[PDB]
Design a protein around this ligand. Sequence first.
Ligand code: HEM
Ligand code: HEM
Ligand SMILES: O=C1C(O)=C([C@H]2CC[C@H](c3ccc(Cl)cc3)CC2)C(=O)c2ccccc21
Ligand code: FES
Lengths: 74, 123, 199, 50, 127, 107, 330
Amino acid sequence: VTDQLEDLREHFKNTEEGKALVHHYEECAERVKIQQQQPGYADLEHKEDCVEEFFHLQHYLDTATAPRLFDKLK
Amino acid sequence: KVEVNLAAIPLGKNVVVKWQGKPVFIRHRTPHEIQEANSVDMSALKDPQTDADRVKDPQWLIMLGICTHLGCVPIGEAGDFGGWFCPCHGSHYDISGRIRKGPAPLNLEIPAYEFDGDKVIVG
Amino acid sequence: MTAAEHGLHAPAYAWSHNGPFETFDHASIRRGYQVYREVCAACHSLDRVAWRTLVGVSHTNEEVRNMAEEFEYDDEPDEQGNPKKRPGKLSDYIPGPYPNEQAARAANQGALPPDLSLIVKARHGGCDYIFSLLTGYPDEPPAGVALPPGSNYNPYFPGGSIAMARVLFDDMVEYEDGTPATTSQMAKDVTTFLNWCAE
Amino acid sequence: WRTLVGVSHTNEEVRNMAEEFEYDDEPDEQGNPKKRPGKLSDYIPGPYPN
Amino acid sequence: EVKLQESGAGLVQPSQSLSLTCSVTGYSITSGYYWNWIRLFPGNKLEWVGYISNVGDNNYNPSLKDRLSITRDTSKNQFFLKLNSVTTEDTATYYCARSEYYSVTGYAMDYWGQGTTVTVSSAWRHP
Amino acid sequence: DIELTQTPVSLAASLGDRVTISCRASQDINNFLNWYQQKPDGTIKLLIYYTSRLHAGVPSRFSGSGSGTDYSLTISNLEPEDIATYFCQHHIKFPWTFGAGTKLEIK
Amino acid sequence: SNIELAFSSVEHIMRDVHNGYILRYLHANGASFFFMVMFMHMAKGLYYGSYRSPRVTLWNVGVIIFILTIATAFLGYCCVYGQMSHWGATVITNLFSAIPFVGNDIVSWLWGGFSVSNPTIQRFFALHYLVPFIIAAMVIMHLMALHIHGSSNPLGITGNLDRIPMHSYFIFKDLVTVFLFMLILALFVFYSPNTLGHPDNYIPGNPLVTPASIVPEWYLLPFYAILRSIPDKLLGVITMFAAILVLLVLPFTDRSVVRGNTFKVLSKFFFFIFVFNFVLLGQIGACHVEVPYVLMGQIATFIYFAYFLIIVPVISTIENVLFYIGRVNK
Ligand code: HEM
Ligand code: HEM
Ligand SMILES: O=C1C(O)=C([C@H]2CC[C@H](c3ccc(Cl)cc3)CC2)C(=O)c2ccccc21
Ligand code: FES
């Protein structure tokens, strides 16, 4: 059994706005790598991260992975 | 009187312990952090005090986690001063445990303590 | 407040009991107890719930008498003045995994696993937030978030750094009735069971 | 024990008596018992365990 | 941050007075710790000159005690050298520094001036 | 006036390896010994206080130690450029006293 | 009321005592409705200018009652001994340090030891028993004042020309609000029992660890706000208490010549700024000491006291003069 939720999160990541938003994070996840190889990074002090992205994604997921999810369940 | 295992405290770890019904704060201070504390303007300060008086060895910050406003217990590694924030009425404390922003009139109190081996007797 | 310190808002799943006319799903509660027994009991006390209280809700009189006696509570001293054990009675409170606060932390990198009996009320969102923290352990701590040694990431916890590692991994519980022992079905139940426990 | 001090004895005199007995004490870091001598803060222990 | 800024005549004619000044910013002369003078000799060796404290008590070196006068202006957050009767023997780069004090770790100069080089000489310069 | 033996009298080293200056007091100084650092442009910094303890910023690869009357200053690798003359002072009493130094160039 | 059994015993009342959960949810939700209804009662007194002679003493006493009801409900909270309880009880005990010199000792006394400990929850239980009889004692003088002058009217003119007897009109009228009251209270009690409480309170109090969401009771919030608004300890305390006392000047600063905002446009208007400020002030209490919230908090607080002390006597004096020139010849 493909997890009733995992499966539902998947299907929604792969709609229009899912694509649009998984990307937005990737663009950021890449940008992070780039900033990390650099010298004296550990003393950059204001190091970017992509939690703000991440959360914008789950919100889109949640908003759909919630009123739907529960009927797949027992 | 109580006694802490100083070795069991990583460099940059906040440790709380039960003494006299209050909490006692012990941070293991990094040298960058030690510098922040002692490189500051005692006129930008409400209850102005030299970090080196507040501490015996600068590597060890040791104080009663009672917010000198109306006596809550400040959240660690918090605030706008690399110290502590008190969620009760927003008093901000710095990395030497002293008052920067907020209603608190005073710097987080320093208990009596003696070092001994790596055991500090907080009484 | 940064959305990272707050934790992400758990969504409005549609529970069996939500609504003014809705009894719990007792079948669901029954499952959660197993999901409770096999999984989280390893670490978590449920001290304000008594064996008898299960009877008529999730189980039947013996069904709970059985569970009850699988544990040796303390019992009044013999004629000499020396201890003794004894099995449980229905009159008892489901024993914690640990003998005190310390061994609870020793067994968890110095974390104090919350007694669960009251969890669905001692948290905002509650049923949802319980479900979501349990089905919301994502694979990796988001680009840039640097996680301490022995701590996991969760968007639904505040500041993600949760001292509880993920614990739902499909099928690790053998659902006695015979339901998809998933993780979003292992979870939805212990939530409905933990709901009961606090209310 | 303390209640004796100043009445029948002197501070140490009662500190002495006090510590001749091992009261229960909060568990170590592992979660296992321990004894400890008494303090003046204590109540003079009964001969029997129950 | 804290910063120390040297300023003064570094070309003094013998039998006169060497007179430097160390202006600070990012901490105060009258909070805490110690306010020092230290000279770096031609032969690349360092010597402690003296100090004024945070409440202005003068621990001088006794090699130079009969000859100097550390002081301060508190309105201006700065401390002063005045080495009387200068000989070429005194020719060296000069450094101001703040020295902390702890009970445990004792003293340490952790904030140093940028340097001001003096040369005792009877040469003439346009004032 | 407690005098300190700086040694070796400035010995250079190879680009990729360690080194270890040392101090030796004319008296018992009780770990009250700091280590300083003079980059050729003149600037002098703090590196080590109370025999063994880093100052803010000085990279963890710096070490230093000692006790009684004899003290070290062990570096880990001389890259990228630790090129400076490393003085040492006692502060057990007054007046305090630096060493000779120990200039550090490439071999 | 022992600090151990305390938190549990309430769970006991919840899990075990027959109808005990109904006992708790009613006690607690009820305390809230008490406070709503009391604000609406105090509202009504502002709007129609009840506080106004001959009813001053009537008014004043209600200010004493309102004080005793906050004192009462606070203690009843400290008796659950959850998280919000132990820290609530720390701060209120600590308001007394604000008192010059002796202040710390008062607090120590008042604590019966080093911290909000056991001799504390036990006295907080005992004082919780005592005080409600004091309110009732006081409700009697309050009703005595009410009695010798009788109620006012939504017209702020004299009653003495068209009186009718409380039985059976108002007895029956009052019965309508009563049932309605119970209905909403039933609604909360059975369906929304904690839609009014803070989840931090199902957590056993812990003296070493304050939470990081310190929202206090709603009916209390607007004061929490005012308290916080002041970056000074002594002054902040004073200003919190002053937020309630100031209510006693209201019969002097009302400069008008008529009792009642009813025929009073400029008065109505600010009266609802006052209401609405007061609610905002409350919203400010819930949010973190973040920006612009602090500065918003500060401005409301100003608006608050300014309404009694400034707006009202001003407006009402103006409003006298509009009433003159707005008719007469010369
Ligand atoms: C149905 C299964 C389980 C559930 C629903 C559950 C639930 C929870 C909850 C609600 C918290 C509270 C954190 C918060 O909300 O602030 C928590 C924390 C914790 N849990 Fe679990 N748990 C489960 C299983 C386990 C297991 C199997 C272990 C270890 C073997 C464990 C160890 C811990 C520890 C050490 C903490 C402390 C985390 C902290 O202090 O932030 N739990 N758990
Ligand atoms: C235990 C709390 C209280 C009780 C039992 C109570 C009772 C009453 C009753 C029965 C009346 C007559 C019905 C009515 O006019 O509403 C009244 C009116 C009044 N109350 Fe109270 N009250 C309480 C709180 C307060 C407070 C807190 C205040 C002021 C701070 C206050 C001031 C007044 C005034 C001035 C009137 C006259 C209203 C008018 O002229 O119509 N009361 N109260
Ligand atoms: O820090 C506070 C705090 O300051 C109050 C406040 C609320 C208003 C109280 C109040 C006392 C007296 C009066 Cl007349 C009015 C309000 C004062 C304490 C709380 O209720 C509280 C509750 C739980 C945790 C922390 C806190
Ligand atoms: S108690 Fe810390 S801010 Fe008021």
